Amino acid sequence: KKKVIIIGAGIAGLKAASTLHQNGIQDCLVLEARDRVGGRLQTVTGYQGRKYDIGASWHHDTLTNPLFLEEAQLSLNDGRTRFVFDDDNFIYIDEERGRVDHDKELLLEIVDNEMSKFAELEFHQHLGVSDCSFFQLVMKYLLQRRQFLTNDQIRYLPQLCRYLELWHGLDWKLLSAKDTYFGHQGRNAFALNYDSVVQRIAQSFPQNWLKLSCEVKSITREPSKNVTVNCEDGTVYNADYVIITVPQSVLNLSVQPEKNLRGRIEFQPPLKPVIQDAFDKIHFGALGKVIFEFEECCWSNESSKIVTLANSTNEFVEIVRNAENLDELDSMLERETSVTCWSQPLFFVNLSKSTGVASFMMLMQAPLTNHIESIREDKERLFSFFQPVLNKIMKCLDSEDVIDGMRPIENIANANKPVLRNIIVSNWTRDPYSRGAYSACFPGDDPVDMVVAMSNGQDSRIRFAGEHTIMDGAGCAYGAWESGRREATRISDLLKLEH
Amino acid sequence: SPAKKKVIIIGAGIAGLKAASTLHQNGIQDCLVLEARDRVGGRLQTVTGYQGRKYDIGASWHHDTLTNPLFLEEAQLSLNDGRTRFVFDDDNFIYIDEERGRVDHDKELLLEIVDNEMSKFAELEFHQHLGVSDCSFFQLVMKYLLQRRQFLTNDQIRYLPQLCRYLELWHGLDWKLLSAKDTYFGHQGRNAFALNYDSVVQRIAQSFPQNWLKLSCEVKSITREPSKNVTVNCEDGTVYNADYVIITVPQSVLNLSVQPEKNLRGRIEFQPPLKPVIQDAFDKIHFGALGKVIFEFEECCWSNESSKIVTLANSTNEFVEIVRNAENLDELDSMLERETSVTCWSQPLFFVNLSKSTGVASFMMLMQAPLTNHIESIREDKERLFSFFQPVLNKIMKCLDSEDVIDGMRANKPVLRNIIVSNWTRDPYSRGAYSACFPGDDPVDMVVAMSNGQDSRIRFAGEHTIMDGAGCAYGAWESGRREATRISDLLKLEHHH
Ligand SMILES: Cc1cc2nc3c(=O)[nH]c(=O)nc-3n(C[C@H](O)[C@H](O)[C@H](O)COP(=O)(O)OP(=O)(O)OC[C@H]3O[C@@H](n4cnc5c(N)ncnc54)[C@H](O)[C@@H]3O)c2cc1C
Numbered sequence: 003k004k005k006v007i008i009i010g011a012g013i014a015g016l017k018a019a020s021t022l023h024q025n026g027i028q029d030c031l032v033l034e035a036r037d038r039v040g041g042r043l044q045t046v047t048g049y050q051g052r053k054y055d056i057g058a059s060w061h062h063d064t065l066t067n068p069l070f071l072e073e074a075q076l077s078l079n080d081g082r083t084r085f086v087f088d089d090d091n092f093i094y095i096d097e098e099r100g101r102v103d104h105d106k107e108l109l110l111e112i113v114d115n116e117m118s119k120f121a122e123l124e125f126h127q128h129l130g131v132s133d134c135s136f137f138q139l140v141m142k143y144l145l146q147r148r149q150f151l152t153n154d155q156i157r158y159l160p161q162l163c164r165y166l167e168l169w170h171g172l173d174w175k176l177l178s179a180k181d182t183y184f185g186h187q188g189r190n191a192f193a194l195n196y197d198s199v200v201q202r203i204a205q206s207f208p209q210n211w212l213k214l215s216c217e218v219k220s221i222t223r224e225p226s227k228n229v230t231v232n233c234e235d236g237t238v239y240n241a242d243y244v245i246i247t248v249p250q251s252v253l254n255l256s257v258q259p260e261k262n263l264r265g266r267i268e269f270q271p272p273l274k275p276v277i278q279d280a281f282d283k284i285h286f287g288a289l290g291k292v293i294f295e296f297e298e299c300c301w302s303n304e305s306s307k308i309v310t311l312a313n314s315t316n317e318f319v320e321i322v323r324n325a326e327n328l329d330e331l332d333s334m335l336e337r338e339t340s341v342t343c344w345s346q347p348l349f350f351v352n353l354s355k356s357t358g359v360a361s362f363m364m365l366m367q368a369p370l371t372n373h374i375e376s377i378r379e380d381k382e383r384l385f386s387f388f389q390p391v392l393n394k395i396m397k398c399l400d401s402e403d404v405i406d407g408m409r410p411i412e413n414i415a416n417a418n419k420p421v422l423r424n425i426i427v428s429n430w431t432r433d434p435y436s437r438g439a440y441s442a443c444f445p446g447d448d449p450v451d452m453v454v455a456m457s458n459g460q461d462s463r464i465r466f467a468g469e470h471t472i473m474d475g476a477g478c479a480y481g482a483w484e485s486g487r488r489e490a491t492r493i494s495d496l497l498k499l500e501h
Numbered sequence: 502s503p504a505k506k507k508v509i510i511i512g513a514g515i516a517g518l519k520a521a522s523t524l525h526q527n528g529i530q531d532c533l534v535l536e537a538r539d540r541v542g543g544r545l546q547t548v549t550g551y552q553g554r555k556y557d558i559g560a561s562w563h564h565d566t567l568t569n570p571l572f573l574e575e576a577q578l579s580l581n582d583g584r585t586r587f588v589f590d591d592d593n594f595i596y597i598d599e600e601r602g603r604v605d606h607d608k609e610l611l612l613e614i615v616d617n618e619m620s621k622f623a624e625l626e627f628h629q630h631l632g633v634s635d636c637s638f639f640q641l642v643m644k645y646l647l648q649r650r651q652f653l654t655n656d657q658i659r660y661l662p663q664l665c666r667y668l669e670l671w672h673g674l675d676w677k678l679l680s681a682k683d684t685y686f687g688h689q690g691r692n693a694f695a696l697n698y699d700s701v702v703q704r705i706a707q708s709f710p711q712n713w714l715k716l717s718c719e720v721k722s723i724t725r726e727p728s729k730n731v732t733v734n735c736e737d738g739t740v741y742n743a744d745y746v747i748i749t750v751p752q753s754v755l756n757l758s759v760q761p762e763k764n765l766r767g768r769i770e771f772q773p774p775l776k777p778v779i780q781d782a783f784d785k786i787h788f789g790a791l792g793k794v795i796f797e798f799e800e801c802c803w804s805n806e807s808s809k810i811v812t813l814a815n816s817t818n819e820f821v822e823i824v825r826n827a828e829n830l831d832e833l834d835s836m837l838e839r840e841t842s843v844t845c846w847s848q849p850l851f852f853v854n855l856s857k858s859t860g861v862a863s864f865m866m867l868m869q870a871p872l873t874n875h876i877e878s879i880r881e882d883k884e885r886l887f888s889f890f891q892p893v894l895n896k897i898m899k900c901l902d903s904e905d906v907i908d909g910m911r912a913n914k915p916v917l918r919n920i921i922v923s924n925w926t927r928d929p930y931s932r933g934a935y936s937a938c939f940p941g942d943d944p945v946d947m948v949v950a951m952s953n954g955q956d957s958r959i960r961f962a963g964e965h966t967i968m969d970g971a972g973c974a975y976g977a978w979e980s981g982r983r984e985a986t987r988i989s990d991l992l993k994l995e996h997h998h
């Protein structure tokens with residue numbers, strides 16, 4: 003009875019439905035499992051009503067990002083602020099040494115740039131001759147260029163370069179080296195409300211099209227020119243075309259046994275082998291977020307980008323200087339516990355400079371993400387965990403130790419002391435409808451496979467959309483947005499041509 | 502009577518020297534290296550100044566150290582004997598504007614950040630694309646500004662265009678003369694400042710029979726005897742006959758060959774004349790004029806925060822309003838036209854603070870065309886030079902926590918003891934710095950014509966005859982190795998049964 007049934011109300015599904023309406027097609031649905039739209043785009047509220055995108059926050063590749071350009075046109079026409087360019091010079095902090103950024107002797111940023119060029123030459127034309135982990139690649143660089151690196155450069159550079167872990171959401175021993183470096187097509191623009199983007203799109207079509215709390219449990223299309231979809235409860239539907247936009251990791255459940263898994267869809271017939279094979283090419287990263295809200299800013303706003311480096315040792319240097327080769331370096335590196343805020347790099351966005359708000363938006367990676375999100379309810383433990391890194395930042399920013407006021411006790415003796423009032427944590431890895439952040443590469447993965455399979459679709463009536471179904475903007479909000487327009491337009495042309 | 506030689510190499514620059522080095526390495530005997538000047542090295546020349554201080558007035562850096570083959574050789578040497586042959590002197594750039602002072606790493610201007618976006622803008626503009634017309638670098642920057650105006654602050658629109666111009670000192674061409682297609686490009690790793698490029702020249706020169714080198718002989722003509730013999734005449738009248746010749750004269754000097762008048766210094770008369778494919782290539786490639794000036798001071802009495810300093814050319818707010826009001830590329834290109842001499846603030850200038858990198862109290866400054874030609878044309882008037890650069894020198898000292906300079910060519914103040922200038926645009930054996938592109942230029946042409954040769958016996962080498970390392974010391978180096986190796990392969994058959 004329906005022209006098109008869109009599964010999932012994330013940006014992919016919403017743009018699609020928005021596009022269909024825009025082209026005059028009627029009688030369409032949008033089945034969302036959650037009781038809200040937005041998918042991995044969620045803006046939450048905390049202390050004093052401040053808002054934060056606990057999901058996607060930035061407009062990437064602003065030079066060609068069509069979604070951004072659309073947002074730009076709007077703002078150009080009405081003068082309203084919808085975003086801010088918050089790129090800035092990064093401040094790097096080592097627990098013991100303090101700041102190490104833009105240093106007249108360490109010059110870490112410069113060797114970091116040679117490092118990147120190194121990775122490029124390494125996989126250039128050879129189909130990534132036996133890929134390895136980002137970690138293995140950095141060690142190869144160090145061994146090969148030690149003659150031209152000082153002791154401190156060999157010590158801090160590898161800890162600094164790991165900021166890239168916050169781009170992929172994966173530890174450097176788990177990340178594929180071939181996909182580590184990417185093409186930054188322009189500056190980034192912090193969205194001053196991705197929810198505003200969600201609402202504008204969400205409203206571009208008939209409200210009655212949306213069906214929240216509809217967990218699709220099975221999709222089938224008996225050869226008769228019709229596709230039949232069923233949600234968990236019991237309601238059934240049928241349409242001419244269907245666009246599946248669930249995340250990759252959820253759609254990956256369709257291959258295993260036990261339709262018991264929350265989110266998993268039952269395809270009949272089963273998704274063709276070219277699709278199932280794609281999942282063997284790894285995927286799914288775990289970018290997480292922790293928001294630190296203070297009463298007010300009493301620290302320096304020199305920069306909005308701050309990164310704390312995991313501890314490092316001088317013995318590491320000695321080992322590098324002495325390794326005869328890659329193997330000797332590998333084993334020689336045998337340090338045979340307990341994770342702390344200094345066991346991995348952490349990315350903090352100082353929102354005071356870019357947005358005025360006195361809070362820090364922090365990014366974390368797997369395996370830390372899963373752990374921190376597991377104890378998201380225990381605010382006390384959370385504060386104790388991050389307190390040491392939160393204190394080093396304040397010291398490096400002309401302030402002092404943080405005071406714990408999550409259980410407030412108004413005291414005049416806090417005038418110029420930073421007072422923490424609330425802590426917010428993401429939960430993507432524990433949410434059955436997301437099970438992580440976005441597609442990422444493990445050593446040996448090939449992202450293109452899935453793009454082709456997804457884009458080709460199960461068949462003429464079963465199409466796919468989402469951040470894991472396109473090449474440009476892969477794993478990005480604008481990527482999913484465009485993929486949603488892709489399928490809608492394809493189906494939109496076909497319908498017009500019939501009648 | 503004219504002496505017989507297996508191979509004759511014309512020119513003793515690095516290309517010619519590495520050619521000889523390779524030939525000897527492969528057991529080839531009875532060769533010859535003929536050089537017009539009274540020294541070896543060509544565009545690799547280290548001079549002496551105040552108190553015996555040394556400076557490379559030609560090439561001074563090893564570029565692309567991740568893959569640069571000449572650099573790797575020198576590094577293996579230092580790794581074995583522990584002698585200092587080079588120093589990685591890359592640093593954070595200090596940018597200075599005459600009115601505003603330092604504008605680098607500025608928390609509000611963020612010039613370096615949008616400069617990077619510019620690079621990507623340029624990259625998306627050309628790279629991989631077919632049928633894209635070229636333009637000047639200047640024009641490319643104007644387009645960027647117009648298209649991204651909505652996301653740039655007034656001060657970013659004023660100063661970014663002036664900072665982008667540090668690239669002029671990489672090509673030796675003013676932004677309006679420089680082809681945008683050839684402006685940007687990746688560098689394979691950090692640069693390494695040679696602590697005597699002349700030490701590299703000597704090592705290669707000493708790696709082959711010393712009786713092969715014949716300095717002070719300017720070659721006037723090359724003739725191919727249709728019988729496997731090439732006749733070469735020196736100006737002093739000596740005549741030679743060789744099986745092969747490797748011609749490494751600068752591209753600007755070889756260009757004289759395709760013109761009437763054989764009395765110009767360095768010109769070679771070719772019989773038969775250079776094939777049509779070669780002459781014609783001279784239209785699709787040009788020559789830039791990177792130039793230098795060494796300012797020697799008594800002692801360092803200034804901040805050593807960085808070894809890299811760049812003074813931007815003056816800018817105006819009227820430029821901003823025009824960019825803001827422009828309605829399109831045409832209006833902007835038009836609006837940009839008003840109603841006046843050249844000073845040290847009319848173009849960007851690059852200064853290398855040697856005190857930090859080498860501990861020597863001097864500045865090595867790079868200049869570009871057209872300024873280069875004008876400054877070299879007065880290198881003799883030292884007072885005129887000091888007056889011309891005094892304002893930028895003062896501004897730099899102020900920014901490095903010091904005071905105005907004191908003319909001391911005749912306590913805590915900087916005293917200029919000497920000024921040294923380059924002479925490449927005037928030296929008839931150079932006629933400029935190195936190969937460069939003007940909008941519409943296609944360097945691939947010359948490389949192909951040169952690497953293909955005049956014929957089987959008449960070959961070419963030099964910085965203008967190869968892609969990888971084009972314009973660089975290691976490109977000329979490799980090109981020499983290439984022609985020598987080819988000749989060795991051919992002479993190999995001489996021992997087949
Ligand atoms: C912490 C974090 C930070 C990020 N930051 C950025 C950033 O700064 N910039 C950027 O560009 N991208 C960012 N991303 C990625 C971006 O959020 C995603 O690419 C994008 O939201 C994916 O859109 P989508 O429409 O495909 O799916 P949305 O999740 O992304 O999901 C599709 C919809 O399917 C629904 N669904 C799932 N299972 C079922 C079922 N069985 N039945 C019915 N409905 C179902 C879901 O509930 C969901 O609403 C970030 C992601 C994370 C996790």
Ligand SMILES: Cc1cc2nc3c(=O)[nH]c(=O)nc-3n(C[C@H](O)[C@H](O)[C@H](O)COP(=O)(O)OP(=O)(O)OC[C@H]3O[C@@H](n4cnc5c(N)ncnc54)[C@H](O)[C@@H]3O)c2cc1C
Pocket residue numbers: 511512513514515516517535536537538541542543544545558559560561562563564718719720721749750751754766767768769791792793923925930931933934935962963964965972973974975977
């Ligand atoms: C100011 C300046 C700065 C530079 N800086 C760098 C740098 O930092 N890094 C880098 O890699 N490169 C740099 N270069 C470029 C580098 O110096 C050249 O690429 C390289 O030296 C060219 O070598 P060549 O052997 O081809 O020619 P050499 O000049 O370059 O010339 C070949 C030889 O031919 C001789 N000759 C000419 N005509 C005749 C004739 N008729 N008879 C006999 N002999 C003749 C000449 O006298 C000369 O010795 C710079 C160049 C200049 C001008």
